[PDB]
Amino acid sequence: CFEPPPATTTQTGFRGLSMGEVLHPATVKAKKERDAQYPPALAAVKAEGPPVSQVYKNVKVLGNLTEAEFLRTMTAITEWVSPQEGCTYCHDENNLASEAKYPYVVARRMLEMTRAINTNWTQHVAQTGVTCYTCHRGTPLPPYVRYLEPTLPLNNRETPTHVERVETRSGYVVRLAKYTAYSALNYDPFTMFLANDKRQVRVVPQTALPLVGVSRGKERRPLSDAYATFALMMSISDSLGTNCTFCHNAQTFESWGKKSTPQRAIAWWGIRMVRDLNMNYLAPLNASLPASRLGRQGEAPQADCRTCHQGVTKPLFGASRLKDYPELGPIK
Amino acid sequence: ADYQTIYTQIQARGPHITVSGEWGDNDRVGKPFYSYWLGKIGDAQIGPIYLGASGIAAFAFGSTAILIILFNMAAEVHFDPLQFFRQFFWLGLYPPKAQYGMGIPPLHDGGWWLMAGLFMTLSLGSWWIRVYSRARALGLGTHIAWNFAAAIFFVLCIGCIHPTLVGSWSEGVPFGIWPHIDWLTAFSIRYGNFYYCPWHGFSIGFAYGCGLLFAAHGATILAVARFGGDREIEQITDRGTAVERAALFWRWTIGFNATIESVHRWGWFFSLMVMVSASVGILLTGTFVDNWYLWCVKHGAAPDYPAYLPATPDPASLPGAPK
Amino acid sequence: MYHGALAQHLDIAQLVWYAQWLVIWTVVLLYLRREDRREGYPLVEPLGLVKLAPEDGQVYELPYPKTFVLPHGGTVTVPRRRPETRELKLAQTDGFEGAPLQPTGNPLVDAVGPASYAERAEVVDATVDGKAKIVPLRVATDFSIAEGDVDPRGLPVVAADGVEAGTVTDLWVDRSEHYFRYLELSVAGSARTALIPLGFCDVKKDKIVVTSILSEQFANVPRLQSRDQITLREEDKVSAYYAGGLLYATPERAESLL
Amino acid sequence: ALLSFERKYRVRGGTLIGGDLFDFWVGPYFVGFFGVSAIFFIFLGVSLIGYAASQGPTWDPFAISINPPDLKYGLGAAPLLEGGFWQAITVCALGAFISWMLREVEISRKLGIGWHVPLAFCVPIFMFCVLQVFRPLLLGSWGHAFPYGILSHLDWVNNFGYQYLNWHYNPGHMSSVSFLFVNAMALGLHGGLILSVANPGDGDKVKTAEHENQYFRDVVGYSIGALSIHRLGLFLASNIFLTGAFGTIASGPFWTRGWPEWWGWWLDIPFWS
Numbered sequence A: 001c002f003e004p005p006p007a008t009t010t011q012t013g014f015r016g017l018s019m020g021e022v023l024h025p026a027t028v029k030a031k032k033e034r035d036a037q038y039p040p041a042l043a044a045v046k047a048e049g050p051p052v053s054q055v056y057k058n059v060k061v062l063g064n065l066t067e068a069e070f071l072r073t074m075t076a077i078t079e080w081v082s083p084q085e086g087c088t089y090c091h092d093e094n095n096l097a098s099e100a101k102y103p104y105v106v107a108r109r110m111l112e113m114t115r116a117i118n119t120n121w122t123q124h125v126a127q128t129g130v131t132c133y134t135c136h137r138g139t140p141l142p143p144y145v146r147y148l149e150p151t152l153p154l155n156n157r158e159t160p161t162h163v164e165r166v167e168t169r170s171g172y173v174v175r176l177a178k179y180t181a182y183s184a185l186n187y188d189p190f191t192m193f194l195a196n197d198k199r200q201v202r203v204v205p206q207t208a209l210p211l212v213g214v215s216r217g218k219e220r221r222p223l224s225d226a227y228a229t230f231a232l233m234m235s236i237s238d239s240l241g242t243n244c245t246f247c248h249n250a251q252t253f254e255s256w257g258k259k260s261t262p263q264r265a266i267a268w269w270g271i272r273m274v275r276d277l278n279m280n281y282l283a284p285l286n287a288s289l290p291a292s293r294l295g296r297q298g299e300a301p302q303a304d305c306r307t308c309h310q311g312v313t314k315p316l317f318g319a320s321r322l323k324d325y326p327e328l329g330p331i332k
Numbered sequence B: 001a002d003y004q005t006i007y008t009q010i011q012a013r014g015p016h017i018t019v020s021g022e023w024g025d026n027d028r029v030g031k032p033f034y035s036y037w038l039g040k041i042g043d044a045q046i047g048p049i050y051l052g053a054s055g056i057a058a059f060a061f062g063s064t065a066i067l068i069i070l071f072n073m074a075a076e077v078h079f080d081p082l083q084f085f086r087q088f089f090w091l092g093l094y095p096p097k098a099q100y101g102m103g104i105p106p107l108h109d110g111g112w113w114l115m116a117g118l119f120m121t122l123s124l125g126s127w128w129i130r131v132y133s134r135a136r137a138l139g140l141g142t143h144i145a146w147n148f149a150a151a152i153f154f155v156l157c158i159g160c161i162h163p164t165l166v167g168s169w170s171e172g173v174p175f176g177i178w179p180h181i182d183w184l185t186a187f188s189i190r191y192g193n194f195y196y197c198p199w200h201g202f203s204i205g206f207a208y209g210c211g212l213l214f215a216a217h218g219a220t221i222l223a224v225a226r227f228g229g230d231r232e233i234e235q236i237t238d239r240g241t242a243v244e245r246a247a248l249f250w251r252w253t254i255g256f257n258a259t260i261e262s263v264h265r266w267g268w269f270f271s272l273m274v275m276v277s278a279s280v281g282i283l284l285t286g287t288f289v290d291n292w293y294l295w296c297v298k299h300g301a302a303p304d305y306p307a308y309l310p311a312t313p314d315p316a317s318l319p320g321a322p323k
Numbered sequence C: 001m002y003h004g005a006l007a008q009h010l011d012i013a014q015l016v017w018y019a020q021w022l023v024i025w026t027v028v029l030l031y032l033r034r035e036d037r038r039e040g041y042p043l044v045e046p047l048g049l050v051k052l053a054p055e056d057g058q059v060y061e062l063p064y065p066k067t068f069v070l071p072h073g074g075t076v077t078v079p080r081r082r083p084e085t086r087e088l089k090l091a092q093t094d095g096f097e098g099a100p101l102q103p104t105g106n107p108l109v110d111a112v113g114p115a116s117y118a119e120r121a122e123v124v125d126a127t128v129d130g131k132a133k134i135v136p137l138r139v140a141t142d143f144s145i146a147e148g149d150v151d152p153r154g155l156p157v158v159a160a161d162g163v164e165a166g167t168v169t170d171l172w173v174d175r176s177e178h179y180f181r182y183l184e185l186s187v188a189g190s191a192r193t194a195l196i197p198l199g200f201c202d203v204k205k206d207k208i209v210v211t212s213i214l215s216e217q218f219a220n221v222p223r224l225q226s227r228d229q230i231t232l233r234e235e236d237k238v239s240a241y242y243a244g245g246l247l248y249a250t251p252e253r254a255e256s257l258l
Numbered sequence D: 001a002l003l004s005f006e007r008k009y010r011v012r013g014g015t016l017i018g019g020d021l022f023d024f025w026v027g028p029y030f031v032g033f034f035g036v037s038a039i040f041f042i043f044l045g046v047s048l049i050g051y052a053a054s055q056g057p058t059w060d061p062f063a064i065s066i067n068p069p070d071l072k073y074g075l076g077a078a079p080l081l082e083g084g085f086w087q088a089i090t091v092c093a094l095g096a097f098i099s100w101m102l103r104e105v106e107i108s109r110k111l112g113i114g115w116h117v118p119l120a121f122c123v124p125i126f127m128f129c130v131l132q133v134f135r136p137l138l139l140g141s142w143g144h145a146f147p148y149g150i151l152s153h154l155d156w157v158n159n160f161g162y163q164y165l166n167w168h169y170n171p172g173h174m175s176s177v178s179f180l181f182v183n184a185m186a187l188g189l190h191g192g193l194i195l196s197v198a199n200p201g202d203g204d205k206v207k208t209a210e211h212e213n214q215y216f217r218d219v220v221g222y223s224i225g226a227l228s229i230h231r232l233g234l235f236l237a238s239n240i241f242l243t244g245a246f247g248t249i250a251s252g253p254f255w256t257r258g259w260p261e262w263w264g265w266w267l268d269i270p271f272w273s
């Protein structure tokens, strides 16, 4: 039922406003240990010999690396994505230039996506960056992805209940609730807001009085947009293991300036980045995936805030490998 | 200590009294029975109950509304009885999610909600008639009915008057445990934080005052139960030492006092004002104010605070930012 | 353009704000606070001598009289002139305006301070249909003690000093509300009866404990006019008597507890 | 000066401390020792509010705000301008409230009535302590307490709630809200009823105790009775804070997640998961 004291608390607004984090140490420790499994950087290698564009036969992304540099990458990729499966997950034992296994082609696009993240989305990932490990955590299927309908459990490494299974219709409300921090909000924030750029998150008017011409009847946004934004915010908070005051002074959710923390701006960039990733890198990959990876509408698994963050306000508590693997970005 | 104020030490039994009303004396059904444990903290007699036309009409319409809600709820769990009990709190009947304006919504998107709203409203009106006419039948003033009227009026405000004034049924209160709760935040978020709505403030002021008054009034009467202060009607018409001491306790404490009758006017007025203030607030919201916080800023009332972590510009307004 | 805007930086909600305060203060000041004054007004000063004309504020603070049509005949009008006639056996402890008064005699018999009774009608409170409301069980023979509960009839009454002071002979019940309000008891060694409000009674299974007065003080409990019914003023006299004991039964009860 | 019936009650005695020294009235007000301590604390607190408010940005009453210290000062004294004034004012508040309660017991003793009213007044004093003292002790800073300002204290209630994503799902809150609602409803019913019996209108005659019970038996099939509704009303009102205090104390010290998630004890039973 309850969590024993003490609680760790932080301050994120002026004194007296009750803004800041409330954290259970046990829970933080369990997440710290889970995230400390991040494999350490492989030892640096001397840049020696010709570029692998001249040495190997089918190297389209990593072509400016030397042989030892490139094989160091391939070791790191195997550690991050398929340590249990090994190099043969993506490769033919007898022909390392064969694209015959689908993980090869996907991994190539993932290489491009990852460098895109570290080069074009520094407004969100800063100097910390991502690697394949950030999402994959040592398995080819990342533990936290989303379909065009809610699935349970959130961690696909756990085995679903009959009711949790997406085909059991009697369990839909619970599948939806657990994605919105157990609220009864009747909206799926992922397909509404993170799958594409079609919907506006902001719903609150920016004037005191209602403007004539947007304020009556069918000119009005339905109230459901406000439910939906709230649902997105429940989901976002739960995905970072935090509460609203991490980003907002609830005195005025819609105001910036002194009424928002810098984390709110970073979160804003995060919404745009996730949209780019899903629309332009992850959703097109239903062409290249087996039918057992796709959802009930032939969609590929896509990313939300939890995919990288897994319940922590900084993924892997700020761990970085950017300086150790320049080939993953940023790219000049 | 006066143990009588905690519970009845020695209970009494006697023949059941029936005060005759101008009509309906035969529509009292049931046989009275007595509960000894109830009788410790209250009156031991349960029943009979009057059973007029308006009361049955209320039960009729109410059950219809309940049934429409429960059926839609069960549809939400594909009629699995076990998941229905599990998920009961999270199940609901929703007004339209899409913007149809004031057009009648499809049954699958708000029509059933509108239906359940109609029958609940009829049930409330029917019960109101019961509350009113029962008073006149027994030769009593209609004070309760006018308080109850304000409470019904507030429900109509959040249920359909405010939707029709802004012109969208999408703004009604859903039916269900958690979902009617969720509406409060969706609404407050839409209209710019309800803490900054002065009529929220008024309503809360009166609601808190109802707690203050009933704690204070209840405590006062119990403190003068030894002189019979609970027999309030005859203390109104013939002031006894009970109400003299009650009046002097307050006068010597706060500097002024009520009478045994006027304290009930105070209480009645405070109760009424919870609902009247709430209704003015909803009637103004959406029709004439869009963001209550900005409205308080416009009129120079909102507090401001220093930044703690750095002030943060809206990134969407920086040059070259994506949409 | 804006819904709710008016000329020169006014909006409708701003006006309603003012109106709402005006409504509140009107009801509170001009209505409720005058209703509050239908008892005990006009106030009493160190002699209000101006018999020729009333002072203006005393007229302004009062509501128009209202008349209650009583259920068994009669009318009461409030507010009205009701000075307290009876001589009070109290003396001013000082010259200051709000210095306390001191009892000169025995305050329980003299009915001052917490022992004071109100001057209610010397009238028996009545049921809907005219009968006496508060009657002992010997008269109210269709009323019983509920099965479960001590029948106190026969039990002794122990006073504050631990002395048995009498024996409970009957319970008086409210026939309108089905609720016992007094015990009747014979005071031992005095050949009379006394009534006790239940609220002063600790009903145990072998005794009735009564901490408000001493055993000897049961002798001077106000007596009733009739044996089998009580008037509203008598109810006040009886109830007040024990309450006066809370402060007066012993010299130490009026002084500070610390 | 005095109500027509007041003089016979204006007797000596009933104090808790000081005997005759403070046993007197000033106008309608009884004084007593706690009258004196109350005025002391009120004067001190209002002075500190005034001094603190003048060192602040504005004089608009809606925007003045005396705030507690930053969390980093833990449970220690903080500099006057940045939390100290809040600390001082808080102590005056507690002095004033407790004095006020104890003054009411003295008034109760003199009149020979029950102490029920100061008893009831303990509940809101207790709730104030839950918010400003006990819960900040359990968390380790006075910084978690609420600020003194007409509108600013609402911003604290606001953010405090959203620190647990949706406070409405707090079970102690649900209980508290339910008592606030039913208490306001009962007071309307009780006041409505009494007025309806004494004021039938039309020169009709005033009704009776039996009419009171007949009305509620007729409408809802039960009537709790005259004395009992007053006991129930005190019970209902008191439980607004008595049950609410658990939902407040729990948040932070005994629960750090959102309050909706707390209901997983029900939703996630394996039997129907």
Ligand code: BCB
Pocket (backbone or CB within 6 Å): B195, B200, B201, B202, B204, B205, B206, B208, B209, B212, D046, D049, D128, D131, D146, D150, D151, D153, D154, D157
């Ligand atoms: C946990 C949640 C709380 C809360 C949540 C809350 C909300 C959500 C709202 C209020 C509102 C109010 N609160 Mg607040 N509050 C207040 C006082 C107030 C008033 C400004 C106002 C109406 C109160 C009322 O009518 O009650 C009933 C009592 C009555 C009717 C008797 C009259 C009391 C009088 C009107 C109070 C005036 C007090 C003075 C302004 C302050 C004292 C000044 C000094 C210098 C003498 C005090 C004095 C305290 C203390 C000492 O704890 C307190 C604590 C809390 N409030 C907690 C922090 N309160 C409302 C408001 O409009 O604020 C702007 C409002 O909407």
Ligand code: BCB
Pocket (backbone or CB within 6 Å): B062, B065, B066, B069, B120, B123, B124, B151, B152, B154, B155, B158, B175, B183, B184, B185, B187, B188, B193, B194, B195, B197, B199, B200, B203, B204, B207, B274, B277, B278, B279, B281, B282, D157, D181
């Ligand atoms: C984040 C969102 C919040 C919010 C959102 C909110 C909204 C949107 C509205 C309120 C309203 C109100 N809020 Mg507020 N609120 C309140 C208190 C209050 C109430 C005093 C007031 C009136 C509601 C009421 O009494 O309904 C209880 C009584 C009701 C609902 C009447 C029911 C009567 C009916 C006849 C009953 C009959 C039922 C049938 C028997 C059953 C049949 C059913 C079947 C057929 C299905 C406090 C004390 C606080 C604190 C401490 O923070 C707070 C904070 C919040 N409120 C946050 C700001 N609140 C109302 C208001 O005043 O707005 C100006 C309002 O409209």
Ligand code: BCB
Pocket (backbone or CB within 6 Å): B184, D097, D124, D125, D127, D128, D157, D158, D159, D160, D161, D162, D166, D167, D168, D170, D172, D173, D176, D177, D180, D240, D241, D243, D244, D245, D246, D247, D248
């Ligand atoms: C977004 C955040 C929200 C929120 C956050 C919230 C928090 C954080 C807390 C509450 C609490 C409470 N909320 Mg809740 N809330 C409530 C109702 C309530 C109250 C019933 C309850 C107790 C308030 C309290 O502690 O007063 C405090 C009042 C006090 C202490 C009175 C002190 C008086 C003092 C002894 C004397 C003062 C004297 C003056 C200074 C003297 C001046 C007088 C002059 C005239 C001379 C309603 C009805 C609603 C609706 C309709 O939505 C609502 C929504 C919300 N609440 C939003 C969801 N609420 C409290 C609770 O119980 O939670 C379980 C609480 O801690």
Ligand SMILES: C/C=C1/c2cc3[nH]c4c(c3C)C(=O)[C@H](C(=O)OC)c4c3nc(cc4[nH]c(cc(n2)[C@@H]1C)c(C(C)=O)c4C)[C@@H](C)[C@@H]3CCC(=O)OC/C=C(/C)CCC[C@H](C)CCC[C@H](C)CCCC(C)C
Pocket (backbone or CB within 6 Å): B046, B047, B049, B058, B059, B060, B062, B063, B123, B124, B127, B131, B144, B145, B147, B148, B149, B151, B271, B272, B274, B275, D181, D182, D184, D185, D188, D189, D192, D219, D220, D221, D222
């Ligand atoms: C500030 C003003 C307050 C206020 C005022 C007032 N509120 C009143 C009156 C006043 C003056 C009445 O005169 C009337 C009444 O009659 O009281 C005895 C009444 C009402 N307020 C109810 C509920 C409510 N008030 C709420 C709030 C506020 N109100 C605000 C706070 C809330 C909240 C907070 O959500 C709720 C849920 C119902 C009990 C009742 C209507 C039943 C009905 O409309 O029928 C609807 C028809 C049905 C079939 C529903 C059946 C179930 C219900 C519980 C009815 C069952 C009764 C039945 C007799 C049981 C038999 C038992 C028997 C076998 C032993």
Ligand SMILES: C/C=C1/c2cc3[nH]c4c(c3C)C(=O)[C@H](C(=O)OC)c4c3nc(cc4[nH]c(cc(n2)[C@@H]1C)c(C(C)=O)c4C)[C@@H](C)[C@@H]3CCC(=O)OC/C=C(\C)CCC[C@H](C)CCC[C@H](C)CCCC(C)C
Pocket (backbone or CB within 6 Å): B208, B209, B210, B211, B212, B215, B216, B219, B253, B254, D038, D041, D042, D045, D046, D089, D092, D093, D096, D097, D100, D104, D117, D118, D120, D121, D122, D123, D124, D147, D148, D149, D150, D153, D237, D238, D239, D240, D241
């Ligand atoms: C469930 C229990 C209920 C309940 C019960 C009862 N309520 C009682 C009694 C009972 C039984 C009394 O016997 C007593 C009284 O006599 O009635 C006239 C009283 C009283 N209830 C008051 C206020 C009240 N009740 C509230 C709530 C409930 N009550 C709940 C609902 C609320 C809110 C917010 O809800 C308020 C504001 C005062 C009017 C009065 C105390 C006067 C005082 O204490 O004098 C002493 C103090 C002063 C005169 C001023 C002191 C100034 C300090 C030093 C400096 C200010 C500091 C302050 C903290 C700053 C705050 C700023 C602000 C904007 C944040």
Ligand SMILES: CC(C)=CCC/C(C)=C/CC/C(C)=C/CC/C(C)=C/CC/C(C)=C/CC/C(C)=C/CC/C(C)=C/CC1=C(C)C(=O)c2ccccc2C1=O
Pocket (backbone or CB within 6 Å): B212, B213, B216, B217, B218, B220, B221, B243, B246, B247, B250, B251, B253, B254, B255, B256, B257, B258, B259, B260, B263, B266, D026, D029, D030, D031, D035, D036, D038, D039, D042
């Ligand atoms: C200057 C100096 C040295 C003075 C010394 C003396 C001294 C200690 C003075 C104190 C000065 C102070 C601090 C005064 C402030 C007084 C205060 C706190 C007033 C608060 C008033 C408020 C807002 C009350 C809210 C409650 C309210 C709306 C009450 C209105 C209705 C009333 C009067 C209710 C009280 C009341 C109740 C509850 C009954 O049940 C009852 C039953 C039968 C008869 C009368 C009554 C009755 O009067």
Ligand code: HEC
Pocket (backbone or CB within 6 Å): A055, A056, A057, A058, A059, A060, A061, A062, A063, A074, A075, A077, A078, A081, A082, A086, A087, A088, A089, A090, A091, A096, A097, A103, A104, A105, A107, A108
């Ligand atoms: C999927 C996540 C892979 C795992 C595990 C391994 N490799 Fe890989 N490899 C992968 C891709 C998508 C590519 C193409 C790279 C590009 O820039 O286009 C490669 C390439 C190679 C090569 C060069 C082969 C050639 O074209 O001649 C070699 C030699 C190679 N990979 C070796 C290698 C080893 C030894 C691995 C286990 C340590 C390994 N790879 C894992 C995808 C994936």
Ligand code: HEC
Pocket (backbone or CB within 6 Å): A077, A081, A103, A104, A106, A107, A110, A111, A114, A130, A131, A132, A133, A134, A135, A136, A140, A141, A142, A145, A277, A282, A289, A293, A300, A301, A302, A303, A307, A308
């Ligand atoms: C989150 C932003 C990711 C990062 C960074 C990387 N990957 Fe990824 N990958 C991600 C998703 C959501 C998916 C879809 C689920 C799926 O299993 O397809 C994938 C998929 C792959 C695959 C295919 C594996 C399979 O389907 O069995 C491979 C081989 C893969 N990803 C490799 C890979 C590499 C090498 C990465 C770093 C260069 C990398 N991914 C980053 C999410 C994310």
Ligand code: HEC
Pocket (backbone or CB within 6 Å): A201, A202, A203, A204, A205, A229, A230, A233, A234, A236, A237, A240, A242, A243, A244, A245, A246, A247, A248, A253, A254, A255, A263, A264, A265, A267, A268, A271, B189, D162, D165
């Ligand atoms: C940071 C990681 C956040 C947390 C935790 C919460 N919110 Fe949020 N919110 C955040 C951003 C970046 C934005 C802007 C979205 C955009 O695309 O522009 C928002 C927006 C809102 C809004 C809408 C405000 C408007 O202008 O209409 C609301 C009402 C809101 N947020 C509320 C809210 C609540 C209640 C939260 C805790 C449950 C919450 N947010 C968390 C960033 C972050």
Ligand code: HEC
Pocket (backbone or CB within 6 Å): A117, A124, A125, A126, A128, A129, A130, A134, A236, A240, A263, A264, A266, A267, A270, A271, A272, A274, A303, A304, A305, A306, A307, A308, A309, A313, A314, A315, A317, A318
């Ligand atoms: C991997 C591709 C990510 C996805 C998807 C999302 N985030 Fe992220 N975030 C990521 C990194 C590598 C970092 C850097 C950590 C650091 O040390 O700077 C972040 C940072 C944030 C922050 C800043 C938190 C802070 O303490 O300063 C926030 C508020 C944040 N992220 C929010 C957020 C949201 C709301 C997302 C979904 C829209 C989201 N992130 C996705 C990596 C990735």
Ligand SMILES: CC(C)=CCC/C(C)=C/C=C/C(C)=C/C=C/C(C)=C/C=C\C=C(C)\C=C\C=C(/C)CC/C=C(/C)CCCC(C)C
Pocket (backbone or CB within 6 Å): B066, B069, B070, B114, B116, B117, B118, B120, B121, B155, B156, B158, B159, B160, B172, B173, B174, B175, B176, B177, B180
């Ligand atoms: C002209 C026509 C077509 C349109 C106008 C129709 C009209 C007047 C519509 C009005 C609609 C209104 C007033 C809607 C208001 C709805 C509101 C305020 C709903 C609020 C809360 C609902 C709740 C809590 C319902 C929960 C439902 C359940 C728990 C299932 C029902 C079962 C029950 C046992 C009910 C118990 C409720 C409670 C006593 C515990």
Ligand SMILES: CCCCCCCCCCCC[N+](C)(C)[O-]
Pocket (backbone or CB within 6 Å): B053, B054, B057, B122, B125, B126, B129, B133
């Ligand atoms: C809008 C509510 C309409 C409900 C209609 C059904 C109620 C019937 C009223 C009968 C009243 C008869 N009467 C006056 C003798 O009590």
Ligand SMILES: CCCCCCCCCCCC[N+](C)(C)[O-]
Pocket (backbone or CB within 6 Å): B195, B196, B197, B198, B199, B200, B201, B202, B296, B299, B300, B301, C014, C017, D062
């Ligand atoms: C609980 C919300 C209370 C907010 C109170 C704000 C009221 C502002 C009214 C302003 C009156 C108009 N004017 C001219 C003085 O600005």
Ligand SMILES: CCCCCCCCCCCC[N+](C)(C)[O-]
Pocket (backbone or CB within 6 Å): B201, B202, B205, B206, B256, C028, C029, C033
């Ligand atoms: C926010 C709700 C406002 C409620 C206002 C009720 C306050 C009662 C004022 C009592 C005034 C006393 N007196 C003697 C000056 O009339």
Ligand SMILES: [Fe+3]
Pocket (backbone or CB within 6 Å): B217, B221, B232, B264, D190, D194, D230
């Ligand atoms: Fe009463």
